[PDB]
Paper text:
In order to provide a direct correlation of the dynamics observed by NMR with affinity for ceftriaxone separate from acylation, and elucidate whether pH changes and the H514A mutant have a consequence on the PBP2–ceftriaxone interaction, we introduced a catalytically inactive S310A mutant of tPBP2WT (tPBP2WT–S310A, hereafter referred to as tPBP2∗). In the structure of tPBP2∗–H514A, also solved at pH 7.5, the β3–β4 loop of molecule A is similarly partially ordered, and where visible, it adopts the same inward and twisted conformation seen in the tPBP2∗ structure. By contrast, there is continuous electron density for the entire β3–β4 loop in molecule B, indicating that it is ordered, and it adopts an extended β-sheet conformation projecting away from the molecule. It therefore appears that mutating His514 to Ala increases the ordering of the β3–β4 loop in molecule B. In the structure of tPBP2∗ at pH 9.5, we also observed complete density for the β3–β4 loop in molecule B in the extended conformation. Importantly, the loop is ordered in the structure of the H514A mutant, even though these data were collected from crystals buffered at pH 7.5. This suggests that His514 destabilizes the extended conformation of the β3–β4 loop at pH 7.5 but not at pH 9.5. In comparison, increasing the pH to 9.5 reduced the affinity of ceftriaxone by approximately 4-fold (Kd = 0.45 ± 0.06 μM), whereas introduction of the H514A mutation to tPBP2∗ reduced the affinity by approximately 15-fold (Kd = 1.6 ± 0.1 μM). As both increasing pH and the H514A mutation favor the extended β3–β4 loop in solution, these results further support the notion that the extended β3–β4 loop has reduced binding affinity for ceftriaxone.
β-lactam antibiotics, including the extended-spectrum cephalosporin (ESC) ceftriaxone, are analogs of the d-Ala-d-Ala C terminus of the peptidoglycan substrate and as such target PBP2 by binding to and reacting with the active-site serine nucleophile (Ser310 in N. gonorrhoeae PBP2) to form a covalently acylated complex. PBP2 is comprised of an N-terminal membrane anchor, a putative pedestal domain, and a C-terminal catalytic TPase/β-lactam–binding domain. The TPase domain of PBP2 contains a central five-stranded antiparallel β-sheet surrounded by α-helices on both sides. The serine nucleophile, Ser310, located at the N-terminal end of the α2 helix, is spatially adjacent to the β3 strand of the central β-sheet.
Residue numbers in the entry: 236 to 282, 296 to 505, 509 to 573
């Protein structure tokens, strides 16, 4: 009747509490979607006061980067061969920096290493109004109308109020806010070959009519780029799943005072990367023990939830098991 798959939800709820307790976090959330139909297979929240996946508005941090890269590729403002100067720079007083000083990176490196500089430079190739409409067409600031009271629209500030630094920080996930469900929805544009899905709490006999945001070719090429995140040399190797190519993104969103230690560890990805079937999104709110970063904190729960979901759904491994 409903789209909930109890086998996946119980797996997700248990793996979530495991991670939340181990790292002594304030809260956590997991979303599992059918990557081809948008059916919500699992929605787990801890300490399960409210449905945080739908209600809690967060700055996504680095999790939004693949959409800026996809947009730059879709419109032809960059390509897969271009190497971008990724030295840290400033816009007036405000700095734009990565964790490491990379002299140059292509779009694959920007995804792989999670480069704020590279992503902001690609975004700066669009006008403020262009990015505003892009973010709004991704559903940022658009209510899900899931039915749960306390649902949030999200925050997308009017483009006319954007300072140049603010457009830059939005490109790597600060200055706009959305729920984990909204963020998981947006990734259907990458898995469903450029077509954004509306999501559904009930079973779907066929994928509903979505809305195209990217060319099919753009979505496929971006998916390949994101597999470098879980492969050695990427920030999300802790989310690799045995027997699959996993395209994913990690982020450590910082919170208001931006604090250097209070942060929401995020890990979101899909598999099988080339022909995705499952989206898994994990957020761990304010971990205080055994790590800080989305990769190390939310990676392991993603790994087990993704691998179990693929197994539960009977998805054949693409590579030999180890």
């Amino acid at each position: 009747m409903l789209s909930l798959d109890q086998r996946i939800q119980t797996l997700a709820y248990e793996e979530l509490n495991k991670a939340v307790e181990y790292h002594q976090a304030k809260a956590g959330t997991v979303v599992v979607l059918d990557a081809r139909t948008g059916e919500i297979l699992a929605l787990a929240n801890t300490p399960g006061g409210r449905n945080r996946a739908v209600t809690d508005m967060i700055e996504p941090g680095a999790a939004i980067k693949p959409f800026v890269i996809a947009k730059a590729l879709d419109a032809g403002k960059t390509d897969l061969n271009e190497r971008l100067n990724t030295q840290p720079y400033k816009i007036g007083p405000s700095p734009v920096r990565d964790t490491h000083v990379y002299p140059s990176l292509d779009v694959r490196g920007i995804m792989q290493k999670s480069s704020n500089v590279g992503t902001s430079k690609l975004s700066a190739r669009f006008g403020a109004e262009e990015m505003y409409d892009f973010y709004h067409e991704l559903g940022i600031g658009v209510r899900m109308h899931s039915g749960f009271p306390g649902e949030t629209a999200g925050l997308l500030r009017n483009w006319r109020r954007w300072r140049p630094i603010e457009q830059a920080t939005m490109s790597f996930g600060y200055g706009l806010q959305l729920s984990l469900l909204q963020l998981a929805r947006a990734y259907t544009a990458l898995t469903h070959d450029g077509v954004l899905l509306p999501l559904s709490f009930e079973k779907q006999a066929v994928a509903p009519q979505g809305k195209r945001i990217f060319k099919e070719s753009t979505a496929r090429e971006v998916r390949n780029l994101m597999v470098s995140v879980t492969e050695p040399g990427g920030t999300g190797t802790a989310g690799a799943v045995d027997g699959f190519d996993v395209g994913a993104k990690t982020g450590t969103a910082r919170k208001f005072v931006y604090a250097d230690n209070k942060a929401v560890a995020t890990f979101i990805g899909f598999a099988p990367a080339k022909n995705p079937r499952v989206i898994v999104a994990v957020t761990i709110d304010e971990p205080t023990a055994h790590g800080y970063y989305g990769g190390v904190v939310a990676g392991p729960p993603f790994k087990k939830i993704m691998g179990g979901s693929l197994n539960i759904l009977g998805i054949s491994p693409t590579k030999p098991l180890t």
